[PDB]
Design an enzyme around this catalytic site. Structure first.
Site, PDB file in Angstrom:
ATOM      1  N   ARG A 139       0.834  -1.189   0.000  1.00 42.49           N
ATOM      2  CA  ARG A 139       0.000   0.000   0.000  1.00 42.49           C
ATOM      3  C   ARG A 139       0.875   1.247   0.000  1.00 42.49           C
ATOM      4  NH1 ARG A 139      -3.078  -3.936   2.358  1.00 42.49           N
ATOM      5  NH2 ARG A 139      -4.775  -4.551   0.934  1.00 42.49           N
ATOM      6  N   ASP A 168       0.237  -7.201  -3.464  1.00 44.35           N
ATOM      7  CA  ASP A 168      -1.179  -6.930  -3.224  1.00 44.35           C
ATOM      8  C   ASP A 168      -1.781  -6.287  -4.476  1.00 44.35           C
ATOM      9  OD1 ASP A 168      -3.710  -6.119  -1.807  1.00 44.35           O
ATOM     10  OD2 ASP A 168      -2.563  -6.791  -0.051  1.00 44.35           O
ATOM     11  N   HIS A 238      -6.263 -10.547  -3.875  1.00 44.83           N
ATOM     12  CA  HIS A 238      -5.259  -9.490  -3.696  1.00 44.83           C
ATOM     13  C   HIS A 238      -4.189  -9.582  -4.777  1.00 44.83           C
ATOM     14  CE1 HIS A 238      -6.574  -7.529   0.035  1.00 44.83           C
ATOM     15  NE2 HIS A 238      -7.030  -8.720   0.384  1.00 44.83           N
ATOM     16  N   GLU A 305      -9.692 -12.816   1.743  1.00 45.11           N
ATOM     17  CA  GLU A 305     -10.536 -11.864   1.030  1.00 45.11           C
ATOM     18  C   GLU A 305     -10.506 -12.092  -0.479  1.00 45.11           C
ATOM     19  OE1 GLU A 305      -8.835  -8.108   2.501  1.00 45.11           O
ATOM     20  OE2 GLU A 305     -10.519  -8.013   3.897  1.00 45.11           O
ATOM     21  N   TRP A 371      -7.064 -13.941  12.018  1.00 48.87           N
ATOM     22  CA  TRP A 371      -7.241 -12.493  12.076  1.00 48.87           C
ATOM     23  C   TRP A 371      -8.692 -12.059  12.270  1.00 48.87           C
ATOM     24  CZ3 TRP A 371      -9.761  -9.256   8.474  1.00 48.87           C
ATOM     25  CH2 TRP A 371     -10.184  -9.858   7.279  1.00 48.87           C
ATOM     26  N   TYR A 398      -4.368  -5.273  15.008  1.00 51.46           N
ATOM     27  CA  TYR A 398      -4.387  -4.581  13.722  1.00 51.46           C
ATOM     28  C   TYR A 398      -3.918  -3.152  13.986  1.00 51.46           C
ATOM     29  CZ  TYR A 398      -5.880  -7.926  10.309  1.00 51.46           C
ATOM     30  OH  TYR A 398      -5.881  -8.968   9.406  1.00 51.46           O
ATOM     31  N   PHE A 399      -2.632  -2.894  13.749  1.00 49.58           N
ATOM     32  CA  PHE A 399      -2.065  -1.615  14.151  1.00 49.58           C
ATOM     33  C   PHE A 399      -2.272  -0.530  13.098  1.00 49.58           C
ATOM     34  CE2 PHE A 399       1.239  -3.264  17.530  1.00 49.58           C
ATOM     35  CZ  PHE A 399       0.184  -3.720  18.302  1.00 49.58           C
ATOM     36  N   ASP A 400      -3.014  -0.822  12.022  1.00 52.20           N
ATOM     37  CA  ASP A 400      -3.555   0.272  11.238  1.00 52.20           C
ATOM     38  C   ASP A 400      -4.685   0.978  11.978  1.00 52.20           C
ATOM     39  OD1 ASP A 400      -4.845  -2.247  10.763  1.00 52.20           O
ATOM     40  OD2 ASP A 400      -5.832  -1.490   8.959  1.00 52.20           O
ATOM     41  N   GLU A 454      -2.408   1.314   4.042  1.00 55.88           N
ATOM     42  CA  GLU A 454      -3.280   2.210   3.279  1.00 55.88           C
ATOM     43  C   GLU A 454      -3.115   3.661   3.726  1.00 55.88           C
ATOM     44  OE1 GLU A 454      -4.251  -0.710   4.420  1.00 55.88           O
ATOM     45  OE2 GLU A 454      -5.770  -1.670   3.147  1.00 55.88           O
TER      46      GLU A 454
END
Length: 526
Positions: A139, A168, A238, A305, A371, A398-400, A454
């Site tokens: 990203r 990705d 992805h 996903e 996850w 999830y450290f985003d 992202e």
């Protein structure tokens, strides 16, 4: 005595530590003498100098004695500090690295304010064998010099695994000699979402990849710091960047087939086709991954996903399903992952994938990276079937995700969502699922935080998202659960900040939530 040294501020808290704060310690005012013939002295030199202590390599009568004790295993160690010597026992190089990191976090002031080590004894080993961070270079991409700063901090807190998310939808960063378009085409997107206005494109191309020598340099640098780099190549989803580079790898017979390196965040629909040609390509890619990461025990194949609609719309995919007695596209995904697992196993490595790999049947030999915390039965089912798991729950790691209050309102500090995942929340994680049979606890390899990028363009923002939460994770990953104590952890956390400030780390301040480096520039420019 009347002078008492401060107690160590080591994070993670050691499993067994006896500090005699009143007794005479070991003086560091004139530096540390290291045995010049031992290769471990070069690592001790690095770690002591990182913490402001001079060292010299000496022929005889060194201050540090390195001893070998195979019963301490891969990562265990002992420390004994007296006024006469610093004795470090380990069963492997990495146990000595961890002993050295505990030592520098035990430095305290003597009577006269000079640096000293207290009289102390430590016996320490990790609770979990997998203690990881995942870097998303797709990203946004970080340069090697920034990854190296990350790896230095990972070693300090005894992380031993770097999961490198290298491919990705919005970029492919992994150099594959046989398929050069994966990086020359798949490494470039025409624009990115506007910072502060994610529903709009910025019109600025964004490109890059790591060269083969850069991959190998990162792997070696990490290895010297006790860290195994595990590569991830995403499939069957992805996959937009790879398919943009080689459109024949996608589901070419669907209506409106228009692959591209994607310019927007979120889940995309371009999946690899389940054809013989795609499996030949993947086998060649896996072969080059094994050459770049020859010591990695795992290849991560993603598996997360992957929307089934393109396969539903593809006569080619439907015929593969009929050929192979596959009832639906979930079984098609399981088939895809099974075939790739054979490629990985044939090269002496193990497959790991996101917990969607149980769709249509979880292979008995795969390792599962858990996850989706909203589906707690998946990890329970994986354990009951005998599989190893790594816990990366989006509830905790999830450290985003955002953190507690105090961040700047400026668009540069925007995050994916307004979930507040504080370091206190992280510290309260218990990785072993409730009700796990005692005899299956060894299947819980450990835990790891994922740093999706992202909304993380460069290192100062990465540091804000990762520190101090990664320090809480380091303790969860290493320290026995029954020794965790949030009040004591906060005291040790506060005593870490001078070291982090000296490196200019832009951590999220525990006291008020503000960036430690408020003038740090957050930008996509490289």
């Amino acid at each position: 005595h009347h002078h008492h040294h401060m107690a160590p501020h080591t994070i993670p808290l050691p499993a067994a530590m006896r500090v005699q704060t009143g007794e005479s310690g070991f003086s560091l005012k004139n530096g540390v003498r290291l045995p010049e013939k031992n290769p471990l002295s070069r690592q001790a030199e690095r770690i002591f100098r990182d913490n402001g202590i001079n060292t010299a390599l000496v022929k005889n009568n060194a201050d540090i004695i390195f001893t070998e004790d195979a019963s301490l295993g891969r990562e265990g160690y002992r420390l004994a500090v007296t006024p006469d010597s610093i004795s470090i026992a380990s069963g492997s190089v990495n146990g000595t690295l961890y002993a050295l990191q505990s030592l520098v976090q035990s430095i305290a002031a003597d009577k006269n304010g000079a640096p000293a080590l207290p009289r102390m004894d430590v016996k320490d080993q990790p609770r979990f064998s997998w203690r990881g961070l995942m870097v998303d270079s797709c990203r946004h991409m970080m340069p090697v010099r920034d990854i190296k700063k990350v790896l230095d901090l990972m070693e300090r807190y005894k992380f031993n695994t770097l999961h490198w998310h290298l491919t990705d939808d919005q970029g492919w960063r992994l150099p594959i000699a046989k398929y050069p378009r994966l990086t020359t085409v798949g490494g470039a997107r025409a624009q990115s979402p506007v910072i502060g206005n994610r529903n709009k494109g910025d019109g600025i191309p964004y490109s890059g990849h790591y060269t083969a020598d850069e991959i190998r340099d990162v792997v070696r640098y990490a290895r010297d710091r006790g860290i195994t780099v595990i590569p991830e190549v995403e499939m069957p989803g992805h996959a937009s960047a790879a398919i943009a580079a080689y459109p024949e790898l996608g589901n070419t017979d669907i209506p409106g087939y228009e692959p591209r390196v994607q310019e927007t965040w979120g889940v995309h629909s371009y999946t690899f086709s389940p054809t013989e040609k795609t499996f030949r390509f993947l086998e060649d890619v896996i072969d080059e991954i094994c050459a770049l990461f020859p010591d990695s025990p795992y290849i991560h194949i993603g598996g997360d996903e992957a929307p089934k609609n393109q396969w539903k719309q593809s006569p080619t995919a439907q015929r593969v399903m009929k050929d192979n007695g596959l009832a639906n596209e979930h079984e098609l995904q399981s088939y895809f992952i099974r075939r790739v697992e054979k490629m990985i196993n044939n090269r002496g490595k193990r497959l790991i994938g996101w917990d969607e790999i149980q769709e249509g049947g979880l292979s008995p030999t795969a390792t599962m990276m858990v996850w989706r915390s909203q589906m707690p039965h998946i990890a329970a089912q994986a354990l009951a079937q005998g599989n190893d798991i790594v816990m990366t729950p989006n509830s905790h790691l999830y450290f985003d995700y955002d953190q507690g209050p105090g961040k700047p309102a400026a668009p540069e500090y925007e995050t994916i969502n307004n979930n507040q995942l504080t370091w206190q929340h992280v510290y309260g994680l218990e990785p072993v699922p409730q009700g796990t049979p005692r005899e299956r606890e060894k299947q819980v390899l450990g835990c790891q935080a994922n740093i999706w990028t992202e909304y993380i363009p460069n290192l100062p923002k990465w540091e804000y998202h990762v520190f101090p939460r990664a320090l809480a994770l380091a303790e969860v990953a290493w320290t026995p659960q029954e020794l965790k104590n949030e009040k004591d952890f906060r005291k040790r956390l506060d005593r870490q900040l001078p070291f982090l400030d000296a490196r200019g780390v832009n951590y999220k301040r525990p006291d008020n939530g503000a960036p430690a480096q408020p003038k740090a520039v957050i930008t996509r420019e490289r």
